[PDB]
Design a protein around this ligand. Sequence first.
Ligand SMILES: *[B]([O])([O])[C]([C]C1=[C]OC2=[C][C]=[C][C]=C12)[N]C(=O)[C]1[C][C]2[C][C][C]1O2
Ligand code: NA
Ligand code: NA
Ligand code: NA
Ligand code: NA
Ligand code: NA
Lengths: 204, 242, 223, 243, 199, 240, 236, 229
Amino acid sequence: SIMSYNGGAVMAMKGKNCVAIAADRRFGIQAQMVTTDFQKIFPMGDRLYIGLAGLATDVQTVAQRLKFRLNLYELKEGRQIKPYTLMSMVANLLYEKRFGPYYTEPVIAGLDPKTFKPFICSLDLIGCPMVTDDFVVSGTCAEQMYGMCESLWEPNMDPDHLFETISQAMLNAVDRDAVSGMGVIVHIIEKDKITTRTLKARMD
Amino acid sequence: GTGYDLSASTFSPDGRVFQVEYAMKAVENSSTAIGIRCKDGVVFGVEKLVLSKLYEEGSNKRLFNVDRHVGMAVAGLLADARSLADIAREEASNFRSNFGYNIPLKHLADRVAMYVHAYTLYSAVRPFGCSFMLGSYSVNDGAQLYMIDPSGVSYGYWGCAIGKARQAAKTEIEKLQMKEMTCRDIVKEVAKIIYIVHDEVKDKAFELELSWVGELTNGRHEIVPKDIREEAEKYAKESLKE
Amino acid sequence: TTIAGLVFQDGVILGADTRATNDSVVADKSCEKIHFIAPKIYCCGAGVAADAEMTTRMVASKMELHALSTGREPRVATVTRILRQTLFRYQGHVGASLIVGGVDLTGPQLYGVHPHGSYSRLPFTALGSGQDAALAVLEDRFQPNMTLEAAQGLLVEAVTAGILGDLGSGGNVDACVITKTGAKLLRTLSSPTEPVKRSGRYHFVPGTTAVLTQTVKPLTLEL
Amino acid sequence: SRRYDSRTTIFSPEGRLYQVEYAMEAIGHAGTCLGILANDGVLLAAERRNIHKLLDEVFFSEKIYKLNEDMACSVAGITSDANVLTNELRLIAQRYLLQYQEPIPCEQLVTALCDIKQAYTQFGGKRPFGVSLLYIGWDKHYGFQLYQSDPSGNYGGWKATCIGNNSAAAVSMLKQDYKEGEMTLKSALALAIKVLNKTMLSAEKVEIATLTRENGKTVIRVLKQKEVEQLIKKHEEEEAKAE
Amino acid sequence: TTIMAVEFDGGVVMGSDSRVSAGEAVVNRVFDKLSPLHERIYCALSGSAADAQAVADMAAYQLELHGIELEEPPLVLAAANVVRNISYKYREDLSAHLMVAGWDQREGGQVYGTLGGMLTRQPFAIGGSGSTFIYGYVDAAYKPGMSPEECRRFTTDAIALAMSRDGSSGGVIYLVTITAAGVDHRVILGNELPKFYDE
Amino acid sequence: SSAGFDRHITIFSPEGRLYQVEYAFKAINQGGLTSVAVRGKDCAVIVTQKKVPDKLLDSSTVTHLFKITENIGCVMTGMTADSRSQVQRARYEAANWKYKYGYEIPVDMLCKRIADISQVYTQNAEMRPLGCCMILIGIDEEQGPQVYKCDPAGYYCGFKATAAGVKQTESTSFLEKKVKKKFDWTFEQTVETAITCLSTVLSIDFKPSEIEVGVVTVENPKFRILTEAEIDAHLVALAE
Amino acid sequence: NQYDNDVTVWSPQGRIHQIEYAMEAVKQGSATVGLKSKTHAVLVALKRAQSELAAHQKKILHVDNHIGISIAGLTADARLLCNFMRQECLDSRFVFDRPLPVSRLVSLIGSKTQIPTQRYGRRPYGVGLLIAGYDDMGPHIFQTCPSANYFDCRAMSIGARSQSARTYLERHMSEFMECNLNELVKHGLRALRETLPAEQDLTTKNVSIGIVGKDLEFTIYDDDDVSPFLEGLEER
Amino acid sequence: GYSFSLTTFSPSGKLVQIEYALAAVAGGAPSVGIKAANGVVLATEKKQKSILYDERSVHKVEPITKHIGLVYSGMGPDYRVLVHRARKLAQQYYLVYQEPIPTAQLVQRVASVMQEYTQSGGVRPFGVSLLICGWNEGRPYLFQSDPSGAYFAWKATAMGKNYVNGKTFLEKRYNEDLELEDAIHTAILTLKESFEGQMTEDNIEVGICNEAGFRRLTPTEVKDYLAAI
Ligand SMILES: *[B]([O])([O])[C]([C]C1=[C]OC2=[C][C]=[C][C]=C12)[N]C(=O)[C]1[C][C]2[C][C][C]1O2
Ligand code: NA
Ligand code: NA
Ligand code: NA
Ligand code: NA
Ligand code: NA
């Protein structure tokens, strides 16, 4: 499979007035680990982040081409993009290659730059958007993440409660996936601040 | 009118397109051609002035076969006329490829007239210096005679004349009750009218060109055979004396 | 997916389930499959989710331009034509199976549009993986000129047969009742599966996750 | 058709490009626009021509355009032509960043747009863009920079320059009081207020923007009405002390 | 599908079954496969539904503009060549067989086959998956000089016979009678079908 | 006032006029004919001069009334070939509309479309506007009988009654006085008004072969061209 | 003049001056004669030398085994039109395996050369040809002109002072069809001579001969090959 | 086609074809725009040469989308080109961002089209000035876009015949805190200043824009406003 060539896991989770976004840190080609610090989560605003798993080259191309369109947008519009608008912008980008797609399945997490209400979503490789009020997952361990998320997720978690839930859902999911891991990075997005943490994770 | 007369994409202050009127002047300055619709077909006659005795008989023909059932008679700039015969031929051929039968003459005239019209709208091209007639005969359609001018106008006729003696040939055609006459009798009258409008003083010599399409030819457009042409030329010269 | 449609006495009723599956794994428990085209024209989508999303979006957009220019309420046959001719050009590669239902100056109409560009006008229809369950319920009890309440009941039963019988279908029943006086969007008209609650006492004491690195970036300076 | 052809990209007998020269004449009619380079920043101070009681203030500025994270510009000429060019400057900057994953060095962004303006004067048969631009920016190669470009597609880097209405008068006034290497944006702001006061003073008719470096990040800001008024009164009070 | 067209003195009769099937699934059991190309010209659709509908629509559009430029209703031969040229130009990408029949003031009632881009005028013609089982029947039952009612009866019996043997044909029978007078559309319901041996 | 090429091509004059568009309106009158279109309670009728000065012409081919669709007909005034080109375009646009949208093009939409095509000639310099005027009639399913007109300028509008050609100003001055009076606009009243509008304006007592009449009714919405006998029927009624 | 610089511009008299100016190019070039008998088509030409130290410009060109041409006008336009004729002939032998009927090739020249006379920025071909050929309809002499018009001829002459040659050809027209090849070439040479002033005469340097017929493929005779045809008559 | 510009700089640095296009706008029928606190009004003189004109067939006040509207002064046929293009541009924005186009964004995209016609080969500029109204953040928007491709945000403005006097009349009657119903009244008053004849609900056209969107006022609503005049 093309999606399992590099591997990786990305997940987003909604809390009470906050959102979380997490990813593994492995860069590997098939069974060979190459790098243990590969960036998969890219900031698209002060309170808006995109998580990209799948084929490494396309994770980098989609993030770069999305940043291009976003910069032109905020320059023309003279305002920070809304989470839903960034989702539509990713959908258009991905669907433009409907018959030769980028091998990536995005996850978006943020707070509205005016309403501060949490937003989470995901898109398939050809840009079909899916908004949820709990969690979204993408990666080679989507079954593992769905099991962890379905069991651990609770409705109005405080930043610290959310941090523990997303951390345990990622850690335990990627530890049953051969081609995901080498560490986990988590971003907790609040109205007042962004907390970034790397976890003590398995290195095998 | 000077200034407003160099381009077909320019109207003069009084709402006229002079480049089209100047193209019509080239038709008026040309020799006369006539076409008469009768009870069983259409007959064409052309006053074909001989520019030199060195040219062969039949050179610079002004009568064309545009389709097996359609004939064309021209007046004006001859290269433009031949170019229009090729457009009409290709148009008739295209209809057969699309629908599987012979193009109806009114449709062929409408189609060709719109190519002509297209050359009256822009500075990129010039209007055709040509006026032509299309004649046909079908059992379902009857006899049909159309005439297209440099502007792109197409009309159906009973009698028609284009060129130098356009009005002179018209008053002679009006003297015929062609609706109740046959192609065989009308050929005599066509040659007669050409011999009347010819200018012996201004033009040293001319050759008569005769075409026809009717019940006699089985809807085919063809030349009037040498014998029937000689009989029409003898009758035209004999009626010129008396 | 189980999407169904039905023509009754005073209009049309469109029905859909709310599950999106990613190869035997339920990704979305609550997705909207009934799309807006025009105020009195709606469309149920099945097939490739992105293709159904973008084709409905495209025709709603073309229909707004059509209505703005004409100054008239749009026709159901126009959305059928536009959809048909766009799908035909793509030779089935745009995997949109659509149920177009609506009300125009000629009354209620219902159409089935397939990915290849073929269509049919019908009194009732069903599409998606759960189409045969819905179609069995419609064939069993459809009668022409049904009352709104009788037709809504038949539609909920037809979509429910697909939800329970088809593995690729689930969640809730969404419906859209289109009449001469507009459209009433009944989001979650029925939930065949009642809240499946549990003793989900899964709480982690703060500090159970071992952290190696921490960085706090404040945003109060911008606020 | 040769009769109607204006012949915009041809030479005059003195080796002159008349459409370019006629475009320069238009720039003279547009609002005064100046730029001053200092050791701690750069500035653009421009005369506002959209002054009217019934005009609504919907945009951050009138003549100041952010181009990229480290650059901004100001224009003088046909405003619609300036909107075309400023949009293209943003595309060029995004294309550079997509390619190298670094911001476009200031001079490179200027030369790129200038090559497009130059093309309009050599081929195509089209009229040139009737715009002169002043660019302010920062980069890791030359730091704080000021540039000027003309309809000809010609450019130069400057310590202080002026485009638009009374440009020559403002340039000689700048030539007198600019001290090379000893300018701070506090002293450059006072020089901008002084030059504009003669070549035109109220905050309603002025528009100032600064480009500074704060914590390894570029800060581009247009001054508030309260801020501009402090600079106007500080100039008025400096003349009141001379009397 | 089972489609059929018969010429008579003064017009044509066209018939079709009503089943649209995706393999073993009947997707539409009441589909009318007789489409008007003009006032007195119809076509019978078979093969790929998407292709058949696309060709029928382009032919109807081409023929409408043709009829207006010519100031007369198109000839059935012009309709036959319009469909045939499309089917032939795109024979590798199209998989439909559109039988074209109707009436003219010039040639009257005529039936044309456009199978794979060819063109043939026939006294009667049959098409579709169901036509296979009724070749012997139409050869044994066809008689020259049939009246409009005898043609309808023949088309109905032949199509009912195919509908009973062919899994891909079924439903009701749609009939269309085109004459100088106009067109008569008729439906023979699945319960009112003519009965024959069926064991 | 003129500056440069503003009298030769479609560019603004110092007053903001398009001289070339103004000259295209003068080209309509070059034909010497006048047309009238009147809308009624249940119908819409068009009438124009039919001048066949030569017995040598086939009078059946001399017309200014054209069928665009089964239910839409028009009268053309102005330059003949330009008019036949515009009718051809109208026929194409109407057929193309039904192909893409699956319903018949409304009269206002066909008129708007022709007007939009004409506006291009008004803005692009390489070509001239058509020296012709199109008046379309038809019955709208929701809105009733319709009379629409478009210009060499690209303007278009719907009307209660309208005119074109040499006596447009005189025919509109007649029609606006007749529309102001109390009338129950029957088919007979709409047809007579159009005939006696053209007759009073040209100061001519018409003969059947001297005019041509086209009509659309809610009872029979197909565009119908009147025969010499049917025209004569209305002419002898006006003699009384 | 305002109706002088473009082929798309008709003058108020119904004239295209640019076509009439292109016609002049033919009149400026040296004279060439073309005539025919029942079996042969002959082309005779006056080759003009720019100096005593320069050779005499090629006036006769080979098109196909059954066709040859004589030129008068712009030589680059003559070369362009000759190359067109050669290709049209080649295509006919490739597709039909049969020589292209001469009258059909002349029709193609007429269509091809008419195109630039109706398009803006384009110009007429400034060349006139005399075409000798032989096909199922026997020998032929055709004339093509910058105006795009073409003529079927019994005989013809074009170029500088060619009216003199036409006067001779009009008189002896009656003899041509029964002449033997030597008698026919002689008639062409005498017509060519008439254009020349009374001082100069036809030499083996300024004479070119082209012949095609029932038994002869298109052959060009130029210097020593011209000598046999020259010896016969030398009076006037 | 003609590939050279028809608009060029004069020796005095003027784009004379854009100045002549502005004269076409100046000769056009009056148009007024007033941005009230809770909405926007667009009013125009829809005066027809005769009674024979079917008044409800064609419109001057046109919707672009559910929340954007337009009016103009100058060339009617040129206007229709810009309306079609503006409606199209608004749909492209909606397909990509799934959110109604901000008024300023639509104005900018339509101004670009207008600028093209001042530089592109073989075309003259539009002889139209547009007045675009909209509602998007939580506020009303009124913009003017002129033949050169330049745009301006306005609190209130006039265009066409007697526009300089209409703007002075608006200058003294504008209050930033106006209600939409009060702005409609003073918009009809601005038109009355230059209107020649008796103003009825059939020879004037009004369009409004608020949190509910953009719509035209019916002749019955226009009659009720004229009742207080
Ligand atoms: B027949 O040959 O079995 C039939 C023709 C048919 C049925 O429905 C239509 C609709 C429009 C035109 C033709 C037509 N074919 C089918 O029913 C099949 C179902 C679907 C998959 C192949 C083909 O189209
Ligand atoms: Na996913
Ligand atoms: Na792992
Ligand atoms: Na390992
Ligand atoms: Na069966
Ligand atoms: Na023009």
